[PDB]
Amino acid sequence: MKPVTLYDVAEYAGVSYQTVSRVVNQASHVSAKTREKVEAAMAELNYIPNRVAQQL
């Protein structure tokens, strides 16, 4: 599926899931501040930047 259910990142970063999956692929253009919060959360939750459902 992926290293961790991204709702976990979303929730720890305190932000609606809509942001996180968008952030992940950089939503072509997204606001920096959003990224900074997710970015912090990411490392902390043993997660790795661009882990979309592509392995299985």
Side-chain angles (χ1 to χ4, degrees):
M1 183 57 189
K2 65 180 92 288
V4 122
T5 34
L6 283 160
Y7 305 82
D8 179 271
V9 172
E11 232 296 285
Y12 192 95
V15 72
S16 61
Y17 174 68
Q18 189 65 91
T19 43
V20 173
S21 301
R22 282 181 180 346
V23 172
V24 175
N25 294 92
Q26 295 106 91
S28 63
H29 298 118
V30 70
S31 47
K33 280 96 229 30
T34 306
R35 296 205 90 284
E36 280 61 282
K37 191 184 39 169
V38 182
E39 291 177 273
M42 287 211 200
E44 297 171 52
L45 294 166
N46 64 252
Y47 189 62
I48 283 284
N50 221 135
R51 290 303 72 45
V52 279
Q54 270 113 80
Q55 4 51 36
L56 295 165

Short mmCIF file of all heavy atoms in Angstrom, two decimals, unseen atoms left out:
data_model
loop_
_atom_site.label_atom_id
_atom_site.label_comp_id
_atom_site.label_asym_id
_atom_site.label_seq_id
_atom_site.Cartn_x
_atom_site.Cartn_y
_atom_site.Cartn_z
N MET A 1 0.80 -1.25 0.00
CA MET A 1 0.00 0.00 0.00
C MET A 1 0.83 1.30 0.00
O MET A 1 0.63 2.15 -0.88
CB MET A 1 -0.99 -0.05 1.18
CG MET A 1 -1.93 1.16 1.24
SD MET A 1 -2.91 1.42 -0.29
CE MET A 1 -3.62 3.02 0.08
N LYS A 2 1.77 1.36 0.95
CA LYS A 2 2.73 2.46 1.22
C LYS A 2 3.32 2.43 2.67
O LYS A 2 2.69 1.74 3.48
CB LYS A 2 2.24 3.90 0.92
CG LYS A 2 1.07 4.41 1.79
CD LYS A 2 0.67 5.84 1.41
CE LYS A 2 -0.43 5.89 0.36
NZ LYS A 2 0.04 5.49 -0.97
N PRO A 3 4.44 3.09 3.04
CA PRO A 3 4.98 2.97 4.43
C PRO A 3 4.09 3.25 5.63
O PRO A 3 4.30 2.63 6.68
CB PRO A 3 6.29 3.76 4.41
CG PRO A 3 6.79 3.46 3.00
CD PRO A 3 5.52 3.66 2.17
N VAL A 4 3.09 4.12 5.46
CA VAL A 4 2.15 4.50 6.54
C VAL A 4 0.91 5.12 5.83
O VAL A 4 1.05 5.82 4.82
CB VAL A 4 3.12 5.50 7.32
CG1 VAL A 4 2.50 6.92 7.42
CG2 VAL A 4 3.45 5.21 8.79
N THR A 5 -0.31 4.83 6.32
CA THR A 5 -1.62 5.40 5.88
C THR A 5 -1.55 6.93 6.08
O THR A 5 -1.63 7.40 7.20
CB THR A 5 -2.65 4.72 6.87
OG1 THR A 5 -2.09 4.53 8.16
CG2 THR A 5 -3.18 3.30 6.36
N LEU A 6 -1.23 7.68 5.00
CA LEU A 6 -1.06 9.18 4.97
C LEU A 6 -2.03 10.05 5.77
O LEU A 6 -1.66 11.16 6.16
CB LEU A 6 -1.00 9.67 3.48
CG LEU A 6 0.34 9.47 2.66
CD1 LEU A 6 0.32 9.49 1.08
CD2 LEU A 6 1.25 10.58 3.17
N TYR A 7 -3.20 9.52 6.12
CA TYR A 7 -4.10 10.13 7.13
C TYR A 7 -3.37 10.38 8.46
O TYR A 7 -3.55 11.42 9.08
CB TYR A 7 -5.35 9.31 7.52
CG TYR A 7 -6.17 8.94 6.26
CD1 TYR A 7 -5.79 7.83 5.47
CD2 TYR A 7 -7.23 9.80 5.85
CE1 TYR A 7 -6.46 7.59 4.24
CE2 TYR A 7 -7.89 9.55 4.64
CZ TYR A 7 -7.50 8.45 3.84
OH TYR A 7 -8.16 8.22 2.68
N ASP A 8 -2.46 9.46 8.80
CA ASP A 8 -1.57 9.60 9.97
C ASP A 8 -0.72 10.88 9.90
O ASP A 8 -0.87 11.73 10.78
CB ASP A 8 -0.66 8.31 10.20
CG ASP A 8 0.26 8.49 11.40
OD1 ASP A 8 1.37 9.02 11.18
OD2 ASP A 8 -0.17 8.09 12.51
N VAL A 9 -0.07 11.13 8.76
CA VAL A 9 0.65 12.38 8.50
C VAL A 9 -0.22 13.64 8.60
O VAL A 9 -0.02 14.46 9.48
CB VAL A 9 1.44 12.28 7.14
CG1 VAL A 9 2.05 13.62 6.72
CG2 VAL A 9 2.53 11.20 7.22
N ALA A 10 -1.37 13.51 7.96
CA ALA A 10 -2.44 14.52 7.86
C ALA A 10 -2.92 15.00 9.24
O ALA A 10 -2.74 16.16 9.60
CB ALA A 10 -3.64 13.95 7.08
N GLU A 11 -3.23 14.02 10.10
CA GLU A 11 -3.72 14.15 11.46
C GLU A 11 -2.69 14.71 12.44
O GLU A 11 -3.03 15.57 13.27
CB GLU A 11 -4.22 12.78 12.01
CG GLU A 11 -5.63 12.76 12.59
CD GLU A 11 -5.76 13.65 13.83
OE1 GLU A 11 -5.25 13.22 14.89
OE2 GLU A 11 -6.41 14.71 13.70
N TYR A 12 -1.45 14.23 12.36
CA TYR A 12 -0.32 14.70 13.19
C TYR A 12 0.05 16.16 12.83
O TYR A 12 0.44 16.96 13.68
CB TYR A 12 0.92 13.85 12.97
CG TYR A 12 2.04 14.09 13.98
CD1 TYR A 12 2.18 13.27 15.12
CD2 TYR A 12 3.02 14.99 13.59
CE1 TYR A 12 3.38 13.35 15.86
CE2 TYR A 12 4.23 15.08 14.30
CZ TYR A 12 4.40 14.24 15.44
OH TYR A 12 5.57 14.28 16.12
N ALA A 13 -0.13 16.47 11.54
CA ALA A 13 0.11 17.81 10.97
C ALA A 13 -1.17 18.68 11.13
O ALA A 13 -1.20 19.83 10.67
CB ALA A 13 0.42 17.68 9.48
N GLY A 14 -2.24 18.03 11.54
CA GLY A 14 -3.54 18.62 11.97
C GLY A 14 -4.35 19.19 10.79
O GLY A 14 -5.27 19.99 10.99
N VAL A 15 -4.09 18.66 9.60
CA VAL A 15 -4.62 19.20 8.32
C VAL A 15 -5.42 18.11 7.56
O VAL A 15 -5.14 16.92 7.65
CB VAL A 15 -3.37 19.78 7.62
CG1 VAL A 15 -2.39 18.73 7.07
CG2 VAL A 15 -3.65 20.94 6.65
N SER A 16 -6.59 18.55 7.08
CA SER A 16 -7.57 17.79 6.22
C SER A 16 -6.75 16.99 5.16
O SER A 16 -5.91 17.56 4.48
CB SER A 16 -8.60 18.75 5.52
OG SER A 16 -7.90 19.67 4.69
N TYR A 17 -6.98 15.67 5.00
CA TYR A 17 -6.28 14.79 3.98
C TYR A 17 -6.10 15.38 2.57
O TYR A 17 -5.06 15.10 1.96
CB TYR A 17 -7.00 13.41 3.94
CG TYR A 17 -6.50 12.48 2.87
CD1 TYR A 17 -5.20 12.01 3.06
CD2 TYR A 17 -7.28 12.13 1.75
CE1 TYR A 17 -4.63 11.18 2.07
CE2 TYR A 17 -6.72 11.29 0.77
CZ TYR A 17 -5.39 10.84 0.93
OH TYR A 17 -4.73 10.34 -0.14
N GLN A 18 -7.03 16.22 2.15
CA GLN A 18 -6.94 16.90 0.83
C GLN A 18 -5.56 17.53 0.60
O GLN A 18 -4.91 17.15 -0.36
CB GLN A 18 -8.03 18.02 0.59
CG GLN A 18 -8.05 18.54 -0.85
CD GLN A 18 -8.47 17.46 -1.88
OE1 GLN A 18 -9.65 17.32 -2.18
NE2 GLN A 18 -7.58 16.64 -2.42
N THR A 19 -5.03 18.23 1.62
CA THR A 19 -3.68 18.85 1.50
C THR A 19 -2.57 17.81 1.24
O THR A 19 -1.94 17.84 0.20
CB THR A 19 -3.18 19.51 2.74
OG1 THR A 19 -3.33 18.94 4.04
CG2 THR A 19 -3.44 21.08 2.95
N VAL A 20 -2.49 16.80 2.10
CA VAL A 20 -1.31 15.92 2.23
C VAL A 20 -1.01 15.20 0.90
O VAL A 20 0.05 15.44 0.33
CB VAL A 20 -1.27 15.03 3.50
CG1 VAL A 20 -0.13 14.02 3.50
CG2 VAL A 20 -1.04 15.94 4.72
N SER A 21 -2.01 14.55 0.30
CA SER A 21 -1.77 13.89 -0.98
C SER A 21 -1.44 14.72 -2.21
O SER A 21 -0.53 14.41 -2.97
CB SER A 21 -2.63 12.67 -1.31
OG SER A 21 -2.45 11.66 -0.30
N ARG A 22 -1.99 15.93 -2.16
CA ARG A 22 -1.59 17.03 -3.03
C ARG A 22 -0.15 17.53 -2.86
O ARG A 22 0.63 17.47 -3.81
CB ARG A 22 -2.61 18.19 -2.84
CG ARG A 22 -3.93 17.95 -3.59
CD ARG A 22 -4.99 19.13 -3.43
NE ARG A 22 -6.32 19.00 -4.11
CZ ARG A 22 -6.70 18.14 -5.08
NH1 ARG A 22 -5.88 17.68 -6.01
NH2 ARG A 22 -7.98 18.10 -5.38
N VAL A 23 0.24 17.67 -1.59
CA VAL A 23 1.57 18.14 -1.15
C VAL A 23 2.64 17.15 -1.68
O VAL A 23 3.72 17.54 -2.14
CB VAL A 23 1.65 18.20 0.34
CG1 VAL A 23 3.04 18.49 0.90
CG2 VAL A 23 0.75 19.30 0.88
N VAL A 24 2.29 15.89 -1.53
CA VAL A 24 3.15 14.74 -1.79
C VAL A 24 3.75 14.77 -3.23
O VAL A 24 4.96 14.89 -3.40
CB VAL A 24 2.45 13.41 -1.47
CG1 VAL A 24 3.23 12.16 -1.83
CG2 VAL A 24 2.23 13.37 0.05
N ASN A 25 2.84 14.99 -4.18
CA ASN A 25 3.20 15.25 -5.60
C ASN A 25 3.40 16.73 -5.99
O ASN A 25 3.26 17.13 -7.15
CB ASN A 25 2.31 14.52 -6.62
CG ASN A 25 2.50 12.98 -6.53
OD1 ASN A 25 1.79 12.31 -5.81
ND2 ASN A 25 3.54 12.36 -7.08
N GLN A 26 3.54 17.57 -4.96
CA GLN A 26 3.80 19.00 -4.99
C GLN A 26 2.75 19.91 -5.64
O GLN A 26 2.87 21.14 -5.70
CB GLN A 26 5.20 19.37 -5.57
CG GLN A 26 6.36 18.86 -4.70
CD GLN A 26 7.04 17.66 -5.38
OE1 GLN A 26 8.00 17.83 -6.12
NE2 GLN A 26 6.63 16.42 -5.18
N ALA A 27 1.61 19.26 -5.80
CA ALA A 27 0.41 19.71 -6.52
C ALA A 27 0.64 20.68 -7.69
O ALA A 27 -0.23 21.48 -8.07
CB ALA A 27 -0.58 20.31 -5.50
N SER A 28 1.70 20.36 -8.45
CA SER A 28 2.37 21.23 -9.44
C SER A 28 2.88 22.58 -8.92
O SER A 28 4.07 22.87 -9.02
CB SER A 28 1.59 21.40 -10.77
OG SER A 28 0.33 22.05 -10.57
N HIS A 29 1.98 23.33 -8.28
CA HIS A 29 2.34 24.56 -7.53
C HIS A 29 1.54 24.53 -6.20
O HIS A 29 0.31 24.38 -6.24
CB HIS A 29 1.90 25.92 -8.14
CG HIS A 29 2.58 26.12 -9.52
ND1 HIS A 29 1.88 26.23 -10.64
CD2 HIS A 29 3.88 26.28 -9.87
CE1 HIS A 29 2.69 26.56 -11.64
NE2 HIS A 29 3.92 26.61 -11.14
N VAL A 30 2.19 24.48 -5.02
CA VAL A 30 1.47 24.67 -3.73
C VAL A 30 2.20 25.63 -2.77
O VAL A 30 3.41 25.82 -2.85
CB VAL A 30 1.35 23.19 -3.16
CG1 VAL A 30 2.66 22.57 -2.71
CG2 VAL A 30 0.31 23.03 -1.96
N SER A 31 1.43 26.26 -1.86
CA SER A 31 1.95 27.21 -0.85
C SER A 31 3.00 26.56 0.11
O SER A 31 2.70 25.61 0.81
CB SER A 31 0.81 27.78 0.00
OG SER A 31 -0.06 26.73 0.45
N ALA A 32 4.15 27.23 0.23
CA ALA A 32 5.32 26.73 0.99
C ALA A 32 5.01 26.30 2.44
O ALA A 32 5.37 25.22 2.87
CB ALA A 32 6.46 27.78 1.03
N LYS A 33 4.39 27.20 3.19
CA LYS A 33 4.00 26.99 4.59
C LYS A 33 3.28 25.66 4.92
O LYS A 33 3.74 24.92 5.78
CB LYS A 33 3.22 28.19 5.16
CG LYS A 33 4.07 29.39 5.62
CD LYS A 33 4.21 30.55 4.58
CE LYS A 33 5.63 31.09 4.29
NZ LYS A 33 6.75 30.13 4.44
N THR A 34 2.44 25.24 3.97
CA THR A 34 1.70 23.96 3.98
C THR A 34 2.72 22.80 4.02
O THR A 34 2.79 22.01 4.96
CB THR A 34 0.82 23.83 2.74
OG1 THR A 34 -0.04 24.95 2.59
CG2 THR A 34 -0.08 22.55 2.78
N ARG A 35 3.69 22.92 3.10
CA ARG A 35 4.80 21.99 2.90
C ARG A 35 5.70 21.84 4.12
O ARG A 35 5.72 20.76 4.70
CB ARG A 35 5.63 22.40 1.67
CG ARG A 35 4.78 22.30 0.38
CD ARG A 35 5.61 22.08 -0.94
NE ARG A 35 5.79 20.65 -1.24
CZ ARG A 35 6.64 19.80 -0.64
NH1 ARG A 35 7.74 20.24 -0.03
NH2 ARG A 35 6.56 18.52 -0.92
N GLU A 36 6.01 22.98 4.75
CA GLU A 36 6.87 23.05 5.93
C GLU A 36 6.40 22.24 7.15
O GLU A 36 7.13 21.38 7.65
CB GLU A 36 7.06 24.51 6.43
CG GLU A 36 8.08 25.50 5.75
CD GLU A 36 7.82 25.79 4.28
OE1 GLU A 36 8.15 24.94 3.44
OE2 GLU A 36 7.40 26.95 4.02
N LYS A 37 5.09 22.21 7.26
CA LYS A 37 4.32 21.53 8.33
C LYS A 37 4.24 20.01 8.09
O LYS A 37 4.76 19.22 8.89
CB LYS A 37 2.97 22.26 8.31
CG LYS A 37 2.12 21.90 9.50
CD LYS A 37 0.72 22.55 9.40
CE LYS A 37 0.11 22.56 7.99
NZ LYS A 37 -1.31 22.96 8.06
N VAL A 38 3.92 19.66 6.85
CA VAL A 38 3.83 18.28 6.34
C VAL A 38 5.24 17.64 6.44
O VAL A 38 5.41 16.59 7.04
CB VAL A 38 3.41 18.26 4.86
CG1 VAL A 38 3.25 16.84 4.33
CG2 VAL A 38 2.02 18.86 4.51
N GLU A 39 6.24 18.38 5.98
CA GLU A 39 7.68 18.06 5.89
C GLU A 39 8.26 17.65 7.26
O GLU A 39 8.75 16.53 7.42
CB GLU A 39 8.56 19.16 5.29
CG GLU A 39 8.28 19.37 3.79
CD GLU A 39 9.12 20.53 3.25
OE1 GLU A 39 8.65 21.68 3.36
OE2 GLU A 39 10.23 20.25 2.74
N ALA A 40 7.84 18.45 8.24
CA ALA A 40 8.19 18.23 9.65
C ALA A 40 7.59 16.90 10.17
O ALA A 40 8.31 15.94 10.40
CB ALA A 40 7.75 19.42 10.50
N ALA A 41 6.28 16.81 9.94
CA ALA A 41 5.45 15.63 10.27
C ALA A 41 5.99 14.31 9.66
O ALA A 41 6.30 13.37 10.37
CB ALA A 41 4.00 15.84 9.82
N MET A 42 6.46 14.44 8.42
CA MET A 42 6.89 13.33 7.57
C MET A 42 8.03 12.46 8.08
O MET A 42 7.82 11.31 8.46
CB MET A 42 7.27 13.79 6.11
CG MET A 42 6.12 14.19 5.14
SD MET A 42 6.52 13.81 3.39
CE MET A 42 5.44 14.81 2.36
N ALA A 43 9.09 13.18 8.42
CA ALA A 43 10.29 12.57 8.97
C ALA A 43 10.05 11.87 10.33
O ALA A 43 10.25 10.67 10.49
CB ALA A 43 11.47 13.54 9.15
N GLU A 44 9.22 12.58 11.11
CA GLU A 44 8.81 12.22 12.48
C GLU A 44 7.96 10.93 12.58
O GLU A 44 8.07 10.18 13.53
CB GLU A 44 8.09 13.41 13.12
CG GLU A 44 8.95 14.69 13.29
CD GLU A 44 8.09 15.88 13.72
OE1 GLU A 44 7.34 15.74 14.72
OE2 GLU A 44 8.22 16.94 13.08
N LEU A 45 7.16 10.72 11.54
CA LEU A 45 6.20 9.59 11.40
C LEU A 45 6.73 8.43 10.54
O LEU A 45 5.96 7.78 9.84
CB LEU A 45 4.92 10.21 10.76
CG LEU A 45 4.30 11.20 11.76
CD1 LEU A 45 3.27 12.07 11.05
CD2 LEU A 45 3.66 10.50 12.96
N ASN A 46 8.06 8.39 10.43
CA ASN A 46 8.83 7.41 9.66
C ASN A 46 8.47 7.30 8.15
O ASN A 46 8.72 6.30 7.48
CB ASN A 46 8.88 5.97 10.29
CG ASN A 46 7.51 5.29 10.38
OD1 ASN A 46 6.94 5.15 11.46
ND2 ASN A 46 6.86 4.86 9.30
N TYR A 47 7.90 8.38 7.62
CA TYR A 47 7.34 8.42 6.26
C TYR A 47 8.38 9.08 5.35
O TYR A 47 9.03 10.06 5.72
CB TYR A 47 6.11 9.36 6.23
CG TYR A 47 5.35 9.26 4.89
CD1 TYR A 47 4.71 8.09 4.39
CD2 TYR A 47 5.53 10.36 4.06
CE1 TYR A 47 4.24 8.08 3.06
CE2 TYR A 47 5.05 10.39 2.74
CZ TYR A 47 4.39 9.25 2.26
OH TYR A 47 3.85 9.33 1.01
N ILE A 48 8.23 8.76 4.07
CA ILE A 48 9.13 9.22 3.02
C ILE A 48 8.55 9.92 1.79
O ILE A 48 7.67 9.36 1.15
CB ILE A 48 10.14 8.03 2.83
CG1 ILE A 48 11.25 7.89 3.93
CG2 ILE A 48 10.77 7.82 1.44
CD1 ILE A 48 12.48 8.82 4.00
N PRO A 49 8.96 11.17 1.59
CA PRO A 49 8.31 12.19 0.73
C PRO A 49 7.23 11.84 -0.32
O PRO A 49 6.08 12.17 -0.08
CB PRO A 49 9.49 13.05 0.25
CG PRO A 49 10.27 13.17 1.55
CD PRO A 49 10.26 11.72 2.04
N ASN A 50 7.59 11.05 -1.32
CA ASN A 50 6.65 10.82 -2.43
C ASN A 50 6.06 9.40 -2.60
O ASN A 50 5.77 8.92 -3.70
CB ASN A 50 7.22 11.30 -3.82
CG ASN A 50 6.13 12.01 -4.65
OD1 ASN A 50 6.37 13.07 -5.23
ND2 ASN A 50 4.95 11.46 -4.90
N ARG A 51 5.63 8.84 -1.46
CA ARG A 51 5.18 7.42 -1.44
C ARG A 51 3.67 7.31 -1.77
O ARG A 51 2.81 7.39 -0.89
CB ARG A 51 5.44 6.76 -0.08
CG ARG A 51 6.91 6.47 0.35
CD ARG A 51 7.80 5.58 -0.58
NE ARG A 51 8.28 6.14 -1.88
CZ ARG A 51 8.81 7.33 -2.16
NH1 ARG A 51 9.06 8.30 -1.29
NH2 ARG A 51 8.99 7.64 -3.45
N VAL A 52 3.38 7.40 -3.06
CA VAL A 52 2.07 7.06 -3.67
C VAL A 52 1.86 5.52 -3.74
O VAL A 52 2.78 4.76 -3.45
CB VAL A 52 1.92 7.74 -5.05
CG1 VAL A 52 1.48 9.19 -4.85
CG2 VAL A 52 3.15 7.66 -5.99
N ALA A 53 0.63 5.08 -4.00
CA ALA A 53 0.31 3.62 -4.10
C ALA A 53 0.82 2.99 -5.40
O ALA A 53 0.10 2.80 -6.38
CB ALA A 53 -1.19 3.38 -3.87
N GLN A 54 2.14 2.83 -5.41
CA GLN A 54 2.94 2.22 -6.50
C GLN A 54 4.13 1.43 -5.93
O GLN A 54 5.07 1.99 -5.38
CB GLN A 54 3.44 3.31 -7.46
CG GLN A 54 2.46 3.57 -8.62
CD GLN A 54 1.84 4.97 -8.55
OE1 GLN A 54 2.41 5.98 -8.93
NE2 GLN A 54 0.63 5.06 -8.04
N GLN A 55 3.78 0.16 -5.77
CA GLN A 55 4.65 -0.96 -5.36
C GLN A 55 3.91 -2.29 -5.55
O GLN A 55 4.37 -3.16 -6.27
CB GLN A 55 5.17 -0.98 -3.88
CG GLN A 55 4.73 0.09 -2.86
CD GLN A 55 3.22 0.33 -2.72
OE1 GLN A 55 2.37 -0.55 -2.80
NE2 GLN A 55 2.88 1.58 -2.49
N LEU A 56 2.69 -2.32 -5.00
CA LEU A 56 1.79 -3.49 -5.15
C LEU A 56 0.69 -3.30 -6.20
CB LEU A 56 1.16 -3.82 -3.79
CG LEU A 56 2.21 -4.28 -2.76
CD1 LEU A 56 1.61 -4.24 -1.35
CD2 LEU A 56 2.75 -5.67 -3.08
#
